[PDB]
Nucleic acid binder design. Structure first.
Ligand SMILES: Nc1ncnc2c1ncn2[C@@H]1O[C@H](COP(=O)(O)OP(=O)(O)OP(O)(O)=S)[C@@H](O)[C@H]1O
Ligand SMILES: Nc1ncnc2c1ncn2[C@@H]1O[C@H](COP(=O)(O)OP(=O)(O)OP(O)(O)=S)[C@@H](O)[C@H]1O
Ligand SMILES: [Mg+2]
Ligand SMILES: [Mg+2]
Ligand SMILES: [Zn+2]
Lengths: 432, 322, 432, 432, 119, 119, 75
DNA sequence: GGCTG
DNA sequence: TTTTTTTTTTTT
């Protein structure tokens, strides 16, 4: 019903006020319709008013159109008329038409993407999204509607604000009380949490400590390690939970009898979850691979995680961008968005560990202008912490957390606090 | 890419276009049509400068009027998205006669010496014996319609020089008419008895030794073992003597198409002729003969000491470029 | 376009009074249009009024034209349109038509001059201007504009300027008597105004107080927050407007009944504006994202603001610098310039806040020299109010407001004044 | 490649044990391929074993098909052979085929959903899902990778993990007690170890000392020089092994008798290994060259090196990135990743040097931030030691070695230790 | 002798070990031979093993070149077959062929440089 | 520009002094130009002076070639005139001509060497 | 620029690239002060000595004679 | 009657 | 959009 839409854009005002901000040139066929809409949009952009028939016939004459295009536009303009109908069926019909056009465009785009992917390298188009980006596009098209929320309107959105006042989101508590204090009860389900740190300063130590703490609380924890072997991460967890140093395990100070006894003592406890460590090669795993892993864990082991942990965000595959196509910032932002989408879909608290820039290394204080790969990670993330064990905290067997971005509470309340990192047992103890 | 499905989709989409033509030879899929983007030439309504090539790795459209060239997919999406979506989904879905009579033809050797065309061929300086292979007609359209009816709407009396093209068997399966006047629709109007007729002249007259491939049959007359690929597309496979043939093009070093063809030949490692030391500087052999006074034996002498192939040909071509 | 021009010359008054002085016979054609315009001009000269269709036809009947001219003029007269097009588009389009025709005539004239110049000197026209007159002729073609407004012309716009001083066209009051006193009637449109906060001085309390005061005066306020969510800023706004303490909302002392009653009481009042709160991540909002936000609000929400309040200048990002620093001088200077450019181009009062220098923190008196942003903020800021909170003032629930830069008025007139800050309701009350 | 998949399903148990878990009739075709797979699936369901050709033909006779399908199935069944192709290529290719067929089916399904949505509610089928099911449908078709391994469990696999604790075959001792002490048993196979210092401090001295120490332990050492000649580095190795001097070799203080006696005495030792020195022009080698060099070395001589020393990573040339395609942070990190991949493929200890920026060329200490090339090298590295020499140290002939990145052990247990570097002999001497 | 070189790259492990490190894409042709060698090289880079006839056919089907190139590669692959040979004659003949092709490419590039600098 | 080179060799003097040592019979042609340069070089070797046009005719008469080329040579020496061109341009153009012919001869020689090696 | 008119020149004072010391077999630093200029001498410091130990004989005074463009020893 | 990249 | 060298400048 393109002709009706154009006719009521020209000859009606309430319809124009209701539907114009959502109309786009891509919703019209490449014939007379798109060119007529181009003329209307140019007139509105230049004069901030709805053009008349004379205005468009003047705009058509002052246009660089071929004979076929000129004839089609003139015929379409001649065919326009103000058919009296109701301003409740027109709006819904226009919304339906726009949604259908958006779905059609998305289908064509994904069909083209798939065609581009199968092409051999050095011939395939670049900057075109890969196959893994197909669902996201299909998520955007379904979101088209003639209702748009731009900002929070005082006196117009106050019931929702009162609900936000009275209601509080559910929280997965930590085992460290300081994190609960700074997060008002823990972390929410569909979140992307990042623990940035320098190189060789405790990115995996903190993640393994969190994994052990969550495992002792009865959660199903999935540790996806992209840099370390499964046995190494499981040895970190064992050191955390069996109270044996990594030096003792490597040197063989502990015997198999003591190890088995401690493992069985932990097994007999009812307040214990299941921790599963999966190793992927560097750059060999993405969000879709994680979803396949979750599906096989559910099907073959009856395992549904809650505390999915990714060792390093910067190593994982983009899943939306082809490898070595965009810059580090865009690729890491895409990875963060994919991981947060996975966390929201699976209702799992997702924890990761990015790397700070070379400047932040051995720096007593860090800020958001220290992230190495991408500064867009805080925007995508829901809670971001830092590690500041630079020069003298190591001698005192301590650490420091900056709280760069905390969406659960206020970052400027307990911004910097001291953590008792114990590297032999790979754990965090509190200074209290 | 997928050439056949793109050709089919282009055929479906452009079946309705003005001047639409199915210009498809034995090895190419081309569509000629009036360019809907620009309407082709405004002055000439019979021009069809929109051309689709399916022989290309990807069927691509190009207009010679508005100079609009693009892939078939781009045009389809920007003009017919409805079938464009179906096409883009289908993308992963798939994922002889011999001439025996010569009406109105008198052979030049048996023609009267006082005939004006005989005087013209004397101005062309053709060897007298060669006249036994050329006829003269006053009713070229009439003769063609007598042999191939429907070719000419009117059998106008047109005098031309008819060279029958004899196969290796020596059977005239085609004929080329040269208009005697300076003005004509075409200098060489060539009509074949059947579409598979030989495009190479003088094949029946090939002797031992190297074979010289020239441009014009009249040029081949001055040359022993002179064969002439009578127009068409230059294809090595259709050319015999692939071992011993010699390529002789025109002497037009600055001309770009000639050097393009010569590059094509040398990249195939062929044996080509070079004019970089020719004492004469006319465009072709006949021009050197009639103007510079070039005589055939001097020409053969030069050519037998100027044939180059491989890297020798390539380096001698580099200098001859300009 | 000529048909529209003639029709709206015949059937309009404002268009005639606006475009008649810039209308010439040579601008139309050499056929029916020129003859019709000659008839119109003859009628307006003999009778100083716009002719009617019957009078035009009578004049055409009593005129010296051939058969073809008679037919053309009759057809054109019978083809006039009384359609009421919009005035702005009509004036702009007829101006463009006149300019194009004048340029074409001048180009043809200079070509004819050149052709006559290349002729035997004994044989040439004397009336044709010499070649040296070519640059001037084109100038007369370029000096064709229905309305000349290039800047403010002294001695030519003094009557309009006086109407600005009497009507206070630029001032926006403050609702606080002291702030109106030192600004000679409030802040001005197209200005950047900043607050400098020393020790124990929140930056968002003053901004929320100003936003509430502007909201109570009927202004459209756009509050862009960086370190806080939309709900938190709107909660500060509610605290100030509903007289409810900030902690009372979190505790739950105020019930839904009182909240809704107060909100509807405010909604009943016709002297209330609209407040739109938009949240952006830290460092993820330059003063080019604000332009997009304004465009979206105007197109979708029809919300065109008069007050724009940015939560914190330091948290913002310089679009010109691209690189971002937590506390760098070059970025603050660029951010201030970009925000002031936005204020000027949008004709809105723009408010922001910054932290004073550490020396300014310790000293109750704050000097422009004692500012974290030196030579960057006291150079791009029309007004820079300084807020001092010492122990004695806090014990008395007061803050010392000092005026550090006042483009509006004399800085030393009323430099120091005590403000009644309430930290619970986030409000500023005056002190007797 | 349906024929290959079916043939290796019937005639290969290893292929059947990794692909049958993930296989459906929708993946193959709608003609003879689907019918053949349906026969195979029916036979394996009725009898839990892979069918044979005779059994498949008997089942085809028992089953009922139309004439065309019967002929197609007979023709396809006739075309089955063993054809022992590579297992890795076969599984990768069948994974690709399954993924592409699943994507095609998902696209067709969403197109059918969209087509059914446009139908009137009376006409539309209730079995097809709504449009809201489009995204997840496209997502489940992107998670069909072939991977049955779920990973460690920490409670169901602690016996295997303890056995892995006893696998110390990855360790390679250092011949220096301090290095073994700080590495908890020496370096590990398939790791990128770096020895960084300033210009003219002893990086190649340390590399040659490590080469000699590994040679005296019986290892095969491949020294790849990027600046020096083969005979020059071999002179340093001779100075280390024969233990006379560098100048005495060039000053004639060693006669050919003593030179021979020492070389033959070292030949008589059964604890000595093999050392090959290879030189490359600057910026002309990487793992691609190194892999060909490894293959040529293995073919020409019984030499599979356990230790691979690269003179400098920076002088090396990246495989994919051109000579100056991108900046240092990229291509240097790319070369580091390629070298680590080569080491983990060959299961060899990889040693290389790194340069330090000018800021630490005259400093008593050097940090990880003082890496001249990309900071991604101290991300792919495993044991990045650092060599610091001062005037006081050079007076005592004692270079200081600081533990910069220690992945094997605790980086701060022995952070700084003094060595006994003898520059004349190109040897590191432990200090007790 | 490009067919023999490709056939013994496929059906001879000893031949592949010595000739491969040196074989390059610019030593065969501008038609079927270069395309077949590119297929083989891509398979080797992806799997570190010599492809079989089935693998070559699968890679050929998953390729984007035109009908002429596809037919030429298919015919060349169908013509590949192991023959009773001796390692020495093949290594020496391959060395001669590679040296001749290197000289031919070098002189072609020399002519191109000379004809380009004279512009 | 072989005509200009020969004419200014016979007539011009400073040009002859500067350009004669860098002159070889292989730089000119294989036809009339080569024969004329050979005659000039023989005359300058016999008598250590530049010959004249009459001397060239005498040398053609006494030292004869086959008439086929002899006619071309005698019609080649009918156009050599004084034509007082500037010295710098003449030297530069002669240098460019000899450099181009040297490059051509070197390319032909290496092509012949490669062809002989294949035999 | 920071090394000009300085009594000592370090390897980090190289102007255009830090890679030049890394890709150079031997480097010698020529240092001249007012006292050295008045004595017709220059101090040559061994900055990168790949043929020997740079710590030994690191700084010695050459007798540059600027009039004759000659280096003479002091031994 | 062909001719494009 | 980050990354790294070198320089030059300026601000604190
Ligand atoms: N086997 C070990 N025994 C004792 N301490 C260890 C051992 N391995 C590592 N550490 C210590 O653990 C610290 C943190 O190491 P990681 O957990 O790997 O941090 P990291 O950020 O993951 O390092 P990356 O991934 O290489 S950037 C190191 O700095 C060491 O001090
Ligand atoms: N021929 C030599 N005789 C004695 N000492 C030497 C000799 N060559 C080098 N040295 C010493 O070796 C020290 C550093 O050795 P190098 O290996 O050159 O250091 P490096 O520059 O980091 O390594 P490169 O650049 O890859 S050679 C110098 O400071 C000298 O003292
Ligand atoms: Mg780690
Ligand atoms: Mg060095
Ligand atoms: Zn066109």
């Amino acid at each position: 019903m393109v002709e009706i839409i154009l006719s009521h854009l020209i000859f009606d005002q309430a319809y124009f006020s209701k539907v114009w901000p959502y109309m786009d040139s891509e919703y019209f066929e490449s014939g007379p319709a798109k060119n007529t809409f181009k003329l209307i949009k140019s007139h509105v952009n230049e004069y901030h008013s709805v053009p008349s028939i004379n205005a468009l016939n003047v705009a058509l004459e002052n246009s660089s159109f071929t004979e076929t295009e000129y004839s089609g536009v003139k015929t379409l303009i001649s065919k326009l008329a103000d058919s009296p109908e109701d301003h409740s069926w027109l709006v819904k019909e226009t919304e339906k038409y726009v949604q259908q056009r958006a779905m059609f465009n998305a289908t064509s785009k994904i069909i083209e993407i798939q065609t581009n992917a199968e092409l051999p390298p050095e011939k395939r188009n670049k900057k075109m999204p890969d196959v893994g980006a197909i669902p996201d596009i299909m998520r955007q098209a379904l979101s088209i509607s003639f209702d748009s929320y731009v900002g929070h309107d005082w006196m117009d959105d106050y019931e929702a604000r009162w609900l936000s006042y009275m209601n509080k989101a559910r929280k997965v508590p930590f085992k460290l009380r300081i994190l609960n204090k700074i997060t008002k009860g823990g972390a929410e389900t569909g979140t992307l949490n990042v623990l940035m740190a320098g190189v060789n300063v405790g990115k995996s130590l903190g993640l393994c400590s969190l994994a052990a703490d969550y495992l002792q609380l009865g959660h199903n924890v999935l540790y996806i390690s992209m840099e370390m072997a499964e046995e190494v991460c499981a040895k970190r967890i064992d050191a955390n939970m069996l109270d044996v140093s990594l030096d003792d395990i490597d040197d063989g100070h502990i015997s198999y009898a003591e190890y088995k006894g401690k493992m069985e003592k932990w097994r007999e406890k009812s307040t214990l979850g299941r921790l599963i460590v999966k190793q992927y090669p560097t750059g060999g795993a993405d969000a879709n691979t994680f979803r396949s892993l979750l599906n096989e864990l559910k099907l073959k082991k009856n395992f549904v995680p809650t505390i999915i942990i990714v060792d390093y965000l910067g190593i994982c595959k983009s899943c939306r961008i082809r490898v070595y196509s965009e810059n580090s910032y865009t690729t890491v932002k895409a990875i963060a968005e994919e991981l947060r989408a996975l966390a929201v879909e699976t209702e799992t608290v997702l924890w990761t560990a990015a790397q700070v820039g070379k400047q932040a290394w051995d720096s007593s204080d860090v800020n958001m202008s220290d992230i190495a790969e991408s500064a867009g990670l805080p925007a995508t993330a829901d809670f971001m912490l830092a590690v500041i064990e630079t020069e003298e905290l190591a001698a005192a067997e301590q650490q420091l957390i900056k709280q760069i971005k905390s969406r659960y509470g206020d970052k400027n309340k307990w911004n910097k606090f001291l953590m008792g990192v114990q590297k032999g047992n790979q754990k965090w103890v509190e200074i209290e | 890419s997928i050439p056949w499905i793109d050709n089919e989709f282009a055929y479906r989409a452009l079946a309705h276009l003005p001047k639409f033509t199915q210009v498809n030879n034995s090895s190419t899929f081309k569509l000629r049509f009036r360019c809907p983007v620009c309407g082709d030439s405004k002055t000439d309504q019979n021009k069809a400068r929109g051309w689709y090539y399916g022989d290309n790795n990807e069927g691509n459209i190009h207009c010679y009027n508005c100079n609009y060239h693009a892939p078939i997919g781009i045009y389809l999406k920007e003009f017919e998205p409805d079938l464009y979506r179906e096409y883009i989904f289908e993308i992963r879905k798939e994922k002889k006669k011999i001439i025996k009579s010569l009406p109105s033809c008198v052979r030049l050797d048996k023609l009267a010496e006082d005939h004006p065309i005989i005087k013209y061929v004397k101005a062309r300086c053709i060897p007298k014996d060669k006249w036994k292979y050329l006829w003269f007609t006053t009713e070229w359209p009439k003769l063609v319609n007598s042999i191939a009816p429907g070719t000419y709407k009117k059998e106008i009396s047109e005098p031309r020089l008819v060279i029958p093209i004899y196969n290796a068997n020596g059977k005239a399966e085609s004929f080329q008419g040269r208009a005697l006047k300076k003005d004509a629709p075409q200098k060489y109007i060539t009509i074949e008895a059947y579409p598979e007729a030989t495009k190479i002249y003088g094949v029946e007259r090939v002797k031992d030794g190297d074979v010289y491939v020239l441009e014009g049959p009249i040029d081949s007359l001055f040359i022993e073992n002179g064969i002439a690929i009578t127009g068409g597309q230059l294809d090595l496979e259709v050319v015999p003597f692939k071992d011993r043939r010699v390529w002789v093009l025109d002497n037009e070093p600055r001309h770009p198409d000639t050097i393009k063809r010569m590059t094509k030949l040398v990249d195939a490692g062929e044996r080509v002729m070079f004019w970089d030391k020719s004492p004469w500087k006319s465009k072709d052999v006949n021009d050197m003969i009639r103007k510079e006074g070039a005589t055939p034996e001097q020409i053969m002498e030069y050519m037998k000491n100027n044939i180059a192939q491989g890297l020798m040909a390539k380096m001698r071509l580099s200098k001859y470029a300009k």
